[PDB]
Protein: Glycyl-tRNA synthetase
Organism: Homo sapiens
Amino acid sequence: IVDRAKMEDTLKRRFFYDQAFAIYGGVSGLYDFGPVGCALKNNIIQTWRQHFIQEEQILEIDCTMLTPEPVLKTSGHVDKFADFMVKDVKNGECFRADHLLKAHLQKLMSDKKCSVEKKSEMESVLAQLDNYGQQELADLFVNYNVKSPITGNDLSPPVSFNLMFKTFIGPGGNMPGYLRPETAQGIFLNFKRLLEFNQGKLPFAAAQIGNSFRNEISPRSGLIRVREFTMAEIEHFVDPSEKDHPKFQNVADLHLYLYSAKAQVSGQSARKMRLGDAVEQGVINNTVLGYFIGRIYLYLTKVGISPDKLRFRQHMENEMYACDCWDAESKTSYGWIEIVGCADRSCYDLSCHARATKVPLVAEKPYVEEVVPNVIEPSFGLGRIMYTVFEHTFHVREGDEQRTFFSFPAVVAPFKCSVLPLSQNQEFMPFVKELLEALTRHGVSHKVDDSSGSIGRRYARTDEIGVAFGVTIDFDTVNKTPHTATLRDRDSMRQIRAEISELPSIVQDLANGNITWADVEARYPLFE
Amino acid sequence: IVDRAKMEDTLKRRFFYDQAFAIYGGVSGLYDFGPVGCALKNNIIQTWRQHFIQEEQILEIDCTMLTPEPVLKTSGHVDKFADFMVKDVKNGECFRADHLLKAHLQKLMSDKKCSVEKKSEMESVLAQLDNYGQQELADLFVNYNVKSPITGNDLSPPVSFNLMFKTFIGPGGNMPGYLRPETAQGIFLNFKRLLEFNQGKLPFAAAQIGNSFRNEISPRSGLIRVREFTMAEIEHFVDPSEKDHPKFQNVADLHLYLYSAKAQVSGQSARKMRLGDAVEQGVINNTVLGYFIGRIYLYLTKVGISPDKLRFRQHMENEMYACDCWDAESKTSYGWIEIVGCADRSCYDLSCHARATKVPLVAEKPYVEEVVPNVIEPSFGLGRIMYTVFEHTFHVREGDEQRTFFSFPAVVAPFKCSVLPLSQNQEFMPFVKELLEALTRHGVSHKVDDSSGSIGRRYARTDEIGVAFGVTIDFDTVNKTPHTATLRDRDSMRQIRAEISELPSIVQDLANGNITWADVEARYPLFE
């Protein structure tokens, strides 16, 4: 129930992110990220690296965004990576067909002149939107007499509009290509090299952190629907026989909201289950998929997503070379949105590329068995994760001035510690310099505050961009022995007074969750 | 004089980088980076961040790669970002015109039947290749009777081929666009936001680390000529009146090879000058440009480039809204190549975008003067920097087996320390675990070696990918009190024996240049 307008104002004003090409009129679906935005984005990525790449010793690779057409024919993107599009017969404006129909039916279903059996007829139509093919969607548009929501004109019949950006590699026009819509295909194309790199042994995982592109018809959902975006994708290859994850018991005790395909079909709510129980009961198929669900859960929660607004939804059969797929979804002002996909596949692109190229993309276990690995595919939409953190950590202070802050965890806060000295004279610099060097030595990021106004107004700006902690250096710090300084907690605004030399280690422990603010207060004198 | 074939074999074999889409036949100009490649690439970027962004408190931003056409019309890329291209009249193959002519003239100039005055006529033609426009280049092709080097057929007249990848943003075809050829324009488009972010004050600098694209006609120079590549670009805005850099004296004492526009015109060699002297004598225009030259020098040299194969070349007037431009160039097997550009500009894109959009992109100094900033533009071609490091750090061991290694500095080595235990049993794990945790605590990256063969063969693999140090844990380490382990220096292969607990701090100091290998040897017992 966040105030999106107010949050959006702060995000725009402090330049977390803003519309690309604003001065040229902007382009929808495209956003530039400013200094604090990049800081946060970079912390999210760094946290991801430690949590997955380093923790599982994943094989990292960096493939190109430019992709020649045949690669993407084989993966079936050329033929199937499209949204049905309908356009106005007169002026020619384009509309995403599925959404336009859904709006039209919801409109009619709200009418009082509309009958009960008619509404239940349209409710069932909504329950199949994604299944309908071209013809039957074309018929739905005629039957319900759908028009342009802007002008009211007749609409053209639905047509498949491929979502990949097209270009040409090299001169002439003989190598058509695309900007990649995902990074998984690069990992597949490199399967041999990666398997060799792993001494031919299985299991192993590979990852990419990079940009992919999706030429959306009409993005109007802020950061949620963009045409260019950074992904972090993992492809975990596993022998279908040895499909049990050794580290599963590290996450078996986690309690998280699971939303089964059955629960959705039967129409009951999501269940908070013990990860271990879910696997024993058959709800999660296996412990490899299970392990990653829990690891995804820990990552999202570590980076600022609220557990009470986080759930894992299994795909229905109708969504569909099928898969057992679970999406991490967060509760936002746009509703529940997927922020991390996690698919379990047996037959997939690796086999298509194999016969497409006549190059065997298989594993060999000695006795010499051909092993076509299964994959668990954790796919992280970094932009959406960040946007969710914004909505889940944005708060408004209790005051007339309506000051705001983000309760960003210390590991993602643009920086962990603001250092505000009351003066910058020669008497103060030895203390600031020392504090900065100590914070660096303790791996605590920081920035000297040189803004205007009272200490409280200065910290208010700091709070507005979500900086975790603050150290005030005043005249008593510089002039009284021993030299002590105020440590201020962002969330509570409560303050403490410790020796300037002790604070670096105190902030570090707070930032790393070794110590609570309460702990600090129990050990150090309170200060106002 | 590096053995490129041998280096290329190692680079390919250990999967630093390799041809993209190999299994589909490959695409020239495109390369995937494997695990060690990504490690090195990521270290280069991290080192860059500390050296520039953190050191100068640069304003970081992340703009989109997709760019709508008008943006790039204004910057003049649409009309002027092209190479003259000539194609075969029969089969239709394309050739970069400038290179084809240069090959043809060099061919004739090598002929013994060719006269002296004719050769000097062609030498002068080469001295103007870049200046020649379409018509006069077309005439040069007729006059010298240039044909296809493959078939020998007649060539079409030179035509301007724009190097930007074209696409369409959104549906229909009303928003044509391009993949950005550089990141500077994003910083210009965000000038207002960045200036505001900096409290309206000047100077300030902004940076992007990201990919840009250049649709090269025929790339055949490995990593040097690619169609997709990561850049790190800085745009340092400065008041033309206050064009003196406060920190200049930090780099004034550096001695580096400078290659003036005069030296090139007069035809004399590059000069090793003191940075300070160069500025006093007029060779470098000012200390802002000067400061960054020295900072570029320190960065390149820190990351592995050899000073004796590094020079800064000033642009000639003919290269040309002009500029005082200096390129960092490295000596490679492909000759001298630019790896970092550094342009000083007074009139540039900021003013074009201003009148294009009717949005004032100026600074205001109170008295209220309109300030149109100058810019120093350090532009880093990360791929080329990395390739140069490969050529400058690749060595071949003195042996029959022709073992190779990269002498990568510790800050860029894929990881700093290989840990090889002789066993992985329950008696050895407490020591390995402790060593790994200690190395982590000391910020020293590492990887347990689990490969086959003798200790020396194991380390040889480690050396081949340039890992800086090595710690052998053997039975004496686990069974004898006190518990000591071998520390091995990559370059020399010399070994030392210190207590397992002392080594973390010893490796850290080596890696951070606080201590020499010689120092270690003076303090600890030598071991073979």
User: Anything to note?
Assistant: Chain B has three domains: 1-79+164-407, 80-163, 408-528. Chain B has 19 helices and 27 strands. The domain at 408-528 of chain B is CATH 3.40.50.800 (Rossmann fold).
